[PDB]
Amino acid sequence: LRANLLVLLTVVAVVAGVALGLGVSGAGGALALGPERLSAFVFPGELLLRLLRMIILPLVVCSLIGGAASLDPGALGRLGAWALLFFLVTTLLASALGVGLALALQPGAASAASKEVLDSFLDLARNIFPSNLVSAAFRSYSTTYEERRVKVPVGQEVEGMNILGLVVFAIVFGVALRKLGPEGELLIRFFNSFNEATMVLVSWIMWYAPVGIMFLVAGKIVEMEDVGLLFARLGKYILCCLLGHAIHGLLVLPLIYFLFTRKNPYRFLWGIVTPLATAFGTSSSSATLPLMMKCVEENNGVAKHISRFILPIGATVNMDGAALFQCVAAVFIAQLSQQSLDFVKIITILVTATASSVGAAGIPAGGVLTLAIILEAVNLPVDHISLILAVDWLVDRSCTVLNVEGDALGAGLLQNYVD
Ligand code: NA
Protein backbone atom coordinates (compact mmCIF):
# COMPACT_ATOMS: atom_id res chain seq x y z
CA LEU A 1 0.00 0.00 0.00
CA ARG A 2 1.08 3.60 -0.55
CA ALA A 3 1.18 4.27 3.20
CA ASN A 4 3.70 1.44 3.51
CA LEU A 5 5.61 2.83 0.52
CA LEU A 6 5.79 6.26 2.14
CA VAL A 7 6.92 4.77 5.46
CA LEU A 8 9.58 2.68 3.73
CA LEU A 9 10.86 5.69 1.79
CA THR A 10 10.93 7.85 4.92
CA VAL A 11 12.94 5.24 6.83
CA VAL A 12 15.28 4.47 3.91
CA ALA A 13 15.91 8.20 3.54
CA VAL A 14 18.03 8.10 6.70
CA VAL A 15 20.19 5.26 5.36
CA ALA A 16 20.52 6.91 1.95
CA GLY A 17 21.50 10.20 3.59
CA VAL A 18 24.09 8.42 5.71
CA ALA A 19 25.58 6.80 2.61
CA LEU A 20 25.56 10.08 0.67
CA GLY A 21 27.18 11.98 3.53
CA LEU A 22 29.87 9.34 3.98
CA GLY A 23 30.61 9.45 0.26
CA VAL A 24 30.79 13.24 0.21
CA SER A 25 33.03 13.30 3.29
CA GLY A 26 35.33 10.70 1.72
CA ALA A 27 35.40 12.82 -1.46
CA GLY A 28 36.78 15.85 0.42
CA GLY A 29 33.70 16.91 2.37
CA ALA A 30 33.00 20.58 3.01
CA LEU A 31 36.49 21.80 2.05
CA ALA A 32 36.18 20.20 -1.39
CA LEU A 33 32.58 21.41 -1.69
CA GLY A 34 33.22 24.93 -0.43
CA PRO A 35 30.67 27.12 1.35
CA GLU A 36 28.57 28.00 -1.70
CA ARG A 37 28.15 24.38 -2.81
CA LEU A 38 27.67 23.09 0.75
CA SER A 39 24.85 25.54 1.44
CA ALA A 40 22.97 24.44 -1.69
CA PHE A 41 23.67 20.79 -0.84
CA VAL A 42 22.14 21.12 2.64
CA PHE A 43 19.31 23.49 1.66
CA PRO A 44 16.61 20.79 1.15
CA GLY A 45 16.86 19.74 4.79
CA GLU A 46 16.29 23.35 5.79
CA LEU A 47 13.25 23.47 3.50
CA LEU A 48 11.84 20.36 5.17
CA LEU A 49 12.44 21.86 8.62
CA ARG A 50 10.68 25.09 7.61
CA LEU A 51 7.72 23.15 6.22
CA LEU A 52 7.45 21.10 9.42
CA ARG A 53 7.66 24.22 11.61
CA MET A 54 4.91 25.89 9.55
CA ILE A 55 2.23 23.36 10.47
CA ILE A 56 2.83 23.27 14.24
CA LEU A 57 0.77 26.35 15.15
CA PRO A 58 -2.58 25.78 13.37
CA LEU A 59 -2.52 21.99 13.72
CA VAL A 60 -1.86 21.98 17.47
CA VAL A 61 -4.12 24.93 18.28
CA CYS A 62 -7.13 23.64 16.33
CA SER A 63 -6.67 20.05 17.51
CA LEU A 64 -6.55 21.14 21.15
CA ILE A 65 -9.55 23.44 20.81
CA GLY A 66 -11.59 20.64 19.28
CA GLY A 67 -10.48 18.01 21.77
CA ALA A 68 -11.16 20.23 24.78
CA ALA A 69 -14.53 21.35 23.41
CA SER A 70 -15.60 17.75 22.67
CA LEU A 71 -15.55 16.61 26.33
CA ASP A 72 -17.48 17.30 29.50
CA PRO A 73 -15.46 19.72 31.69
CA GLY A 74 -15.42 17.33 34.66
CA ALA A 75 -14.48 14.35 32.51
CA LEU A 76 -11.91 16.51 30.73
CA GLY A 77 -10.43 17.52 34.08
CA ARG A 78 -10.15 13.93 35.29
CA LEU A 79 -8.66 12.82 31.97
CA GLY A 80 -6.14 15.66 31.99
CA ALA A 81 -5.11 14.99 35.59
CA TRP A 82 -4.54 11.30 34.83
CA ALA A 83 -2.65 12.16 31.63
CA LEU A 84 -0.42 14.60 33.50
CA LEU A 85 0.30 12.01 36.18
CA PHE A 86 1.16 9.43 33.52
CA PHE A 87 3.43 11.86 31.66
CA LEU A 88 5.25 12.91 34.83
CA VAL A 89 5.74 9.33 36.01
CA THR A 90 7.01 8.19 32.61
CA THR A 91 9.42 11.13 32.35
CA LEU A 92 10.72 10.44 35.86
CA LEU A 93 11.25 6.77 34.98
CA ALA A 94 13.06 7.73 31.78
CA SER A 95 15.33 10.12 33.68
CA ALA A 96 16.08 7.51 36.34
CA LEU A 97 16.85 4.90 33.68
CA GLY A 98 19.15 7.32 31.88
CA VAL A 99 21.07 8.14 35.06
CA GLY A 100 21.32 4.50 36.09
CA LEU A 101 22.46 3.37 32.64
CA ALA A 102 25.22 6.01 32.70
CA LEU A 103 26.55 5.52 36.24
CA ALA A 104 26.93 1.92 35.15
CA LEU A 105 28.31 1.35 31.65
CA GLN A 106 30.27 4.59 32.14
CA PRO A 107 30.37 6.44 28.78
CA GLY A 108 32.92 9.00 29.98
CA ALA A 109 35.61 6.64 31.26
CA ALA A 110 38.09 7.66 28.55
CA SER A 111 40.51 10.56 28.21
CA ALA A 112 40.04 10.93 24.44
CA ALA A 113 37.02 13.21 24.85
CA SER A 114 23.40 31.47 32.01
CA LYS A 115 19.94 31.55 33.55
CA GLU A 116 19.60 30.86 37.25
CA VAL A 117 17.56 27.76 38.03
CA LEU A 118 14.79 29.79 39.68
CA ASP A 119 14.66 32.21 36.75
CA SER A 120 14.29 29.37 34.24
CA PHE A 121 11.21 28.05 36.05
CA LEU A 122 9.82 31.58 36.39
CA ASP A 123 10.21 31.95 32.62
CA LEU A 124 8.46 28.60 32.18
CA ALA A 125 5.57 29.84 34.33
CA ARG A 126 5.43 33.08 32.33
CA ASN A 127 5.35 31.15 29.05
CA ILE A 128 2.53 28.96 30.38
CA PHE A 129 0.45 32.18 30.53
CA PRO A 130 1.33 34.24 27.44
CA SER A 131 0.92 38.00 27.65
CA ASN A 132 -0.15 38.20 23.98
CA LEU A 133 -1.59 35.54 21.69
CA VAL A 134 -0.22 37.02 18.45
CA SER A 135 3.25 37.49 19.94
CA ALA A 136 3.08 34.03 21.53
CA ALA A 137 2.85 32.61 18.01
CA PHE A 138 6.53 33.40 17.34
CA ARG A 139 8.16 34.60 20.60
CA SER A 140 8.82 33.31 24.11
CA TYR A 141 9.70 35.12 27.32
CA SER A 142 13.36 34.84 28.35
CA THR A 143 15.29 36.40 31.22
CA THR A 144 18.71 38.03 30.90
CA TYR A 145 20.63 39.88 33.61
CA GLU A 146 21.78 43.47 34.07
CA GLU A 147 24.43 44.58 36.56
CA ARG A 148 23.41 47.51 38.77
CA ARG A 149 27.23 44.71 40.98
CA VAL A 150 23.85 43.10 41.65
CA LYS A 151 22.70 40.95 38.72
CA VAL A 152 19.03 41.91 38.49
CA PRO A 153 16.98 39.62 36.19
CA VAL A 154 15.28 41.59 33.41
CA GLY A 155 13.17 39.78 30.84
CA GLN A 156 12.20 40.21 27.20
CA GLU A 157 10.48 38.23 24.47
CA VAL A 158 12.89 36.46 22.10
CA GLU A 159 12.40 34.48 18.91
CA GLY A 160 10.93 31.01 19.30
CA MET A 161 7.33 29.82 19.23
CA ASN A 162 5.46 29.65 22.54
CA ILE A 163 3.92 26.22 22.11
CA LEU A 164 3.17 25.65 25.81
CA GLY A 165 1.26 28.90 26.27
CA LEU A 166 -0.72 28.42 23.07
CA VAL A 167 -1.55 24.85 24.13
CA VAL A 168 -2.84 26.08 27.49
CA PHE A 169 -4.88 28.84 25.84
CA ALA A 170 -6.32 26.40 23.30
CA ILE A 171 -7.41 23.99 26.03
CA VAL A 172 -9.02 26.76 28.09
CA PHE A 173 -10.74 28.23 25.02
CA GLY A 174 -12.12 24.82 24.08
CA VAL A 175 -13.46 24.43 27.60
CA ALA A 176 -15.10 27.85 27.26
CA LEU A 177 -16.64 26.87 23.91
CA ARG A 178 -18.03 23.68 25.46
CA LYS A 179 -19.46 25.71 28.36
CA LEU A 180 -21.12 28.17 25.97
CA GLY A 181 -23.48 25.52 24.63
CA PRO A 182 -25.35 25.95 21.34
CA GLU A 183 -23.65 29.31 20.74
CA GLY A 184 -20.18 27.75 20.53
CA GLU A 185 -21.02 25.16 17.87
CA LEU A 186 -20.04 27.47 15.00
CA LEU A 187 -16.50 27.96 16.31
CA ILE A 188 -16.08 24.25 17.06
CA ARG A 189 -17.03 23.48 13.46
CA PHE A 190 -14.69 26.21 12.21
CA PHE A 191 -11.72 24.83 14.15
CA ASN A 192 -12.47 21.24 13.13
CA SER A 193 -12.51 22.29 9.47
CA PHE A 194 -9.24 24.17 9.96
CA ASN A 195 -7.69 21.08 11.57
CA GLU A 196 -8.74 18.82 8.68
CA ALA A 197 -7.41 21.32 6.13
CA THR A 198 -4.08 21.45 7.97
CA MET A 199 -3.89 17.65 8.10
CA VAL A 200 -4.32 17.53 4.32
CA LEU A 201 -1.29 19.80 3.96
CA VAL A 202 0.66 17.65 6.43
CA SER A 203 -0.14 14.58 4.33
CA TRP A 204 1.12 16.40 1.23
CA ILE A 205 4.33 17.43 3.02
CA MET A 206 4.95 13.82 4.07
CA TRP A 207 5.60 13.05 0.39
CA TYR A 208 8.49 15.53 0.20
CA ALA A 209 9.73 14.44 3.64
CA PRO A 210 12.07 11.67 2.34
CA VAL A 211 13.99 14.02 0.04
CA GLY A 212 14.42 16.52 2.86
CA ILE A 213 15.59 13.80 5.25
CA MET A 214 18.17 12.59 2.72
CA PHE A 215 19.98 15.92 2.53
CA LEU A 216 19.41 16.77 6.19
CA VAL A 217 21.26 13.65 7.33
CA ALA A 218 23.89 13.95 4.59
CA GLY A 219 24.70 17.53 5.55
CA LYS A 220 24.64 16.83 9.27
CA ILE A 221 27.19 14.01 8.90
CA VAL A 222 29.25 16.02 6.42
CA GLU A 223 29.69 18.66 9.15
CA MET A 224 31.64 16.11 11.23
CA GLU A 225 35.36 16.54 10.56
CA ASP A 226 36.17 12.87 11.21
CA VAL A 227 33.41 10.26 11.27
CA GLY A 228 35.63 7.45 12.53
CA LEU A 229 37.28 9.46 15.31
CA LEU A 230 34.02 11.04 16.48
CA PHE A 231 32.24 7.69 16.55
CA ALA A 232 35.14 6.00 18.36
CA ARG A 233 34.91 8.82 20.92
CA LEU A 234 31.11 8.78 21.38
CA GLY A 235 30.39 5.08 20.82
CA LYS A 236 29.65 4.37 24.47
CA TYR A 237 27.61 7.57 24.88
CA ILE A 238 25.46 6.70 21.86
CA LEU A 239 25.17 3.14 23.17
CA CYS A 240 23.95 4.43 26.53
CA CYS A 241 21.40 6.74 24.90
CA LEU A 242 20.01 4.19 22.43
CA LEU A 243 20.01 1.35 24.97
CA GLY A 244 18.08 3.49 27.44
CA HIS A 245 15.61 4.44 24.73
CA ALA A 246 15.15 0.80 23.72
CA ILE A 247 14.68 -0.34 27.32
CA HIS A 248 12.15 2.41 28.02
CA GLY A 249 10.18 1.84 24.83
CA LEU A 250 10.17 -1.96 24.74
CA LEU A 251 10.15 -2.89 28.46
CA VAL A 252 9.04 -0.04 30.74
CA LEU A 253 6.13 1.53 28.85
CA PRO A 254 4.75 -1.83 27.63
CA LEU A 255 5.04 -3.13 31.19
CA ILE A 256 3.05 -0.19 32.56
CA TYR A 257 0.44 -0.60 29.82
CA PHE A 258 0.07 -4.31 30.59
CA LEU A 259 -0.08 -3.75 34.35
CA PHE A 260 -2.84 -1.15 34.08
CA THR A 261 -4.92 -2.45 31.15
CA ARG A 262 -3.80 -6.11 31.12
CA LYS A 263 -4.01 -6.15 27.32
CA ASN A 264 -1.15 -6.90 24.95
CA PRO A 265 1.04 -3.78 24.58
CA TYR A 266 2.95 -5.02 21.54
CA ARG A 267 -0.30 -5.53 19.63
CA PHE A 268 -0.92 -1.85 20.41
CA LEU A 269 2.54 -0.85 19.17
CA TRP A 270 2.02 -2.89 16.00
CA GLY A 271 -0.89 -0.61 15.11
CA ILE A 272 1.23 2.55 15.35
CA VAL A 273 4.51 1.27 13.89
CA THR A 274 3.83 3.57 10.92
CA PRO A 275 3.67 6.75 13.05
CA LEU A 276 6.79 5.48 14.83
CA ALA A 277 8.61 5.12 11.51
CA THR A 278 7.53 8.63 10.50
CA ALA A 279 8.74 9.96 13.86
CA PHE A 280 12.13 8.30 13.42
CA GLY A 281 12.47 9.61 9.87
CA THR A 282 11.38 13.20 10.46
CA SER A 283 12.21 13.77 14.16
CA SER A 284 9.02 15.88 14.32
CA SER A 285 6.14 15.07 16.66
CA SER A 286 3.70 17.33 14.81
CA ALA A 287 4.50 15.47 11.59
CA THR A 288 3.31 12.19 13.11
CA LEU A 289 0.48 13.78 15.11
CA PRO A 290 -2.17 13.41 12.35
CA LEU A 291 -0.93 9.97 11.28
CA MET A 292 -0.57 8.92 14.93
CA MET A 293 -4.12 10.03 15.71
CA LYS A 294 -5.46 8.24 12.63
CA CYS A 295 -3.69 4.99 13.54
CA VAL A 296 -4.71 5.18 17.20
CA GLU A 297 -8.37 5.84 16.37
CA GLU A 298 -8.64 3.27 13.55
CA ASN A 299 -6.15 0.47 14.29
CA ASN A 300 -6.77 0.68 18.05
CA GLY A 301 -10.01 1.19 19.94
CA VAL A 302 -9.12 4.60 21.37
CA ALA A 303 -12.08 6.98 21.26
CA LYS A 304 -11.69 10.09 19.13
CA HIS A 305 -12.39 12.53 21.97
CA ILE A 306 -9.60 10.86 23.95
CA SER A 307 -6.94 10.85 21.23
CA ARG A 308 -7.67 14.33 19.87
CA PHE A 309 -7.14 15.73 23.38
CA ILE A 310 -4.34 13.60 24.83
CA LEU A 311 -2.01 13.27 21.85
CA PRO A 312 -1.60 17.02 21.12
CA ILE A 313 -0.85 17.65 24.81
CA GLY A 314 1.60 14.76 25.02
CA ALA A 315 3.42 15.94 21.91
CA THR A 316 4.34 19.10 23.85
CA VAL A 317 4.64 17.93 27.46
CA ASN A 318 5.64 14.23 27.24
CA MET A 319 9.35 14.07 26.36
CA ASP A 320 10.54 10.79 27.89
CA GLY A 321 13.22 10.41 25.22
CA ALA A 322 14.43 13.98 25.67
CA ALA A 323 14.64 13.53 29.45
CA LEU A 324 16.60 10.28 29.09
CA PHE A 325 18.97 11.89 26.59
CA GLN A 326 19.50 14.92 28.83
CA CYS A 327 20.20 12.81 31.92
CA VAL A 328 22.62 10.56 30.01
CA ALA A 329 24.42 13.61 28.61
CA ALA A 330 24.63 15.20 32.06
CA VAL A 331 26.16 12.07 33.56
CA PHE A 332 28.53 11.77 30.58
CA ILE A 333 29.73 15.36 31.03
CA ALA A 334 30.06 14.90 34.80
CA GLN A 335 32.26 11.87 34.13
CA LEU A 336 34.32 13.75 31.53
CA SER A 337 35.14 16.45 34.10
CA GLN A 338 35.69 13.78 36.79
CA GLN A 339 33.19 15.68 38.95
CA SER A 340 31.75 12.92 41.12
CA LEU A 341 27.96 13.06 41.51
CA ASP A 342 26.48 12.42 44.94
CA PHE A 343 22.88 11.46 45.69
CA VAL A 344 21.87 15.12 46.09
CA LYS A 345 23.15 15.99 42.61
CA ILE A 346 21.56 12.85 41.13
CA ILE A 347 18.18 13.86 42.56
CA THR A 348 18.76 17.40 41.29
CA ILE A 349 19.43 16.05 37.80
CA LEU A 350 16.30 13.89 37.88
CA VAL A 351 14.01 16.66 39.12
CA THR A 352 15.47 19.34 36.83
CA ALA A 353 15.19 17.12 33.76
CA THR A 354 11.60 16.18 34.61
CA ALA A 355 10.60 19.80 35.24
CA SER A 356 12.37 21.31 32.22
CA SER A 357 11.04 18.60 29.90
CA VAL A 358 7.77 20.54 30.10
CA GLY A 359 7.98 23.40 27.63
CA ALA A 360 10.78 21.85 25.57
CA ALA A 361 10.48 23.84 22.34
CA GLY A 362 10.06 21.99 19.06
CA ILE A 363 13.21 23.56 17.60
CA PRO A 364 16.42 21.49 17.91
CA ALA A 365 17.73 23.96 20.50
CA GLY A 366 14.80 22.96 22.73
CA GLY A 367 16.40 19.61 23.57
CA VAL A 368 19.87 20.97 24.31
CA LEU A 369 19.09 24.20 26.19
CA THR A 370 17.48 22.11 28.93
CA LEU A 371 20.78 20.22 29.08
CA ALA A 372 22.50 23.54 29.80
CA ILE A 373 19.94 24.27 32.52
CA ILE A 374 20.63 20.88 34.11
CA LEU A 375 24.40 21.42 33.92
CA GLU A 376 24.02 24.81 35.60
CA ALA A 377 21.78 23.25 38.25
CA VAL A 378 24.56 20.76 39.02
CA ASN A 379 27.45 23.17 38.26
CA LEU A 380 29.01 21.31 35.27
CA PRO A 381 31.06 22.81 32.41
CA VAL A 382 28.95 23.56 29.34
CA ASP A 383 31.95 23.42 27.00
CA HIS A 384 31.47 19.69 26.39
CA ILE A 385 28.03 20.18 24.80
CA SER A 386 29.80 20.61 21.45
CA LEU A 387 30.36 16.84 21.43
CA ILE A 388 26.78 15.98 22.39
CA LEU A 389 25.24 17.98 19.55
CA ALA A 390 27.64 16.42 17.04
CA VAL A 391 25.57 13.20 16.95
CA ASP A 392 22.11 14.71 17.50
CA TRP A 393 21.12 13.81 13.92
CA LEU A 394 21.00 10.25 15.28
CA VAL A 395 20.21 10.51 18.99
CA ASP A 396 17.48 13.11 18.54
CA ARG A 397 15.74 10.77 16.09
CA SER A 398 15.82 7.96 18.64
CA CYS A 399 14.37 10.45 21.12
CA THR A 400 11.48 11.41 18.85
CA VAL A 401 10.12 7.86 18.66
CA LEU A 402 10.19 7.62 22.45
CA ASN A 403 8.63 11.09 22.50
CA VAL A 404 5.62 9.79 20.54
CA GLU A 405 5.29 6.15 21.64
CA GLY A 406 4.70 7.13 25.25
CA ASP A 407 1.96 9.43 24.01
CA ALA A 408 0.05 6.75 22.11
CA LEU A 409 0.25 4.16 24.88
CA GLY A 410 -0.82 6.93 27.24
CA ALA A 411 -4.07 7.33 25.33
CA GLY A 412 -4.42 3.55 25.28
CA LEU A 413 -4.30 3.65 29.07
CA LEU A 414 -6.95 6.34 29.47
CA GLN A 415 -9.33 4.50 27.13
CA ASN A 416 -9.43 1.70 29.71
CA TYR A 417 -10.05 4.31 32.41
CA VAL A 418 -13.16 5.31 30.45
CA ASP A 419 -14.33 1.78 29.66
NA1 NA B 1 5.64 13.56 23.30
Coordinates of N, CA, C and O and ligand atoms in Angstrom, one line a residue, residues 87 285 311 313-320 400 402-407, ligand 1:
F87 N 2.3 11.2 32.3 CA 3.4 11.9 31.7 C 4.6 12.1 32.7 O 5.7 11.8 32.4
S285 N 7.3 15.6 16.1 CA 6.1 15.1 16.7 C 4.9 15.6 16.0 O 3.9 14.8 15.8
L311 N -3.2 13.3 22.7 CA -2.0 13.3 21.8 C -1.4 14.7 21.6 O -0.2 14.8 21.7
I313 N -1.5 17.2 23.6 CA -0.8 17.6 24.8 C 0.4 16.9 25.0 O 1.5 17.4 25.4
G314 N 0.4 15.6 24.8 CA 1.6 14.8 25.0 C 2.7 15.2 24.1 O 3.9 15.2 24.5
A315 N 2.4 15.5 22.9 CA 3.4 15.9 21.9 C 4.2 17.1 22.4 O 5.3 17.4 21.9
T316 N 3.7 17.9 23.3 CA 4.3 19.1 23.8 C 4.9 18.9 25.2 O 6.0 19.4 25.6
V317 N 4.2 18.1 26.1 CA 4.6 17.9 27.5 C 5.4 16.6 27.7 O 6.2 16.6 28.6
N318 N 5.0 15.5 27.0 CA 5.6 14.2 27.2 C 6.9 14.1 26.4 O 6.8 14.0 25.2
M319 N 8.1 14.1 27.0 CA 9.4 14.1 26.4 C 10.3 13.0 27.0 O 11.4 13.3 27.4
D320 N 9.8 11.8 27.2 CA 10.5 10.8 27.9 C 11.9 10.6 27.2 O 12.9 10.6 27.9
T400 N 12.8 11.0 19.3 CA 11.5 11.4 18.9 C 10.5 10.2 18.9 O 9.4 10.4 19.3
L402 N 10.6 7.7 21.1 CA 10.2 7.6 22.4 C 9.4 8.8 22.9 O 8.6 8.7 23.9
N403 N 9.5 9.9 22.2 CA 8.6 11.1 22.5 C 7.2 10.9 22.0 O 6.3 11.7 22.5
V404 N 7.0 10.0 21.0 CA 5.6 9.8 20.5 C 5.0 8.5 21.0 O 3.8 8.4 21.3
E405 N 5.8 7.4 21.2 CA 5.3 6.1 21.6 C 4.6 6.3 23.0 O 3.4 5.9 23.1
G406 N 5.3 6.9 23.9 CA 4.7 7.1 25.3 C 3.4 7.9 25.2 O 2.5 7.7 26.0
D407 N 3.2 8.8 24.2 CA 2.0 9.4 24.0 C 0.9 8.4 23.6 O -0.2 8.4 24.3
Ligands
NA1 NA 5.6 13.6 23.3

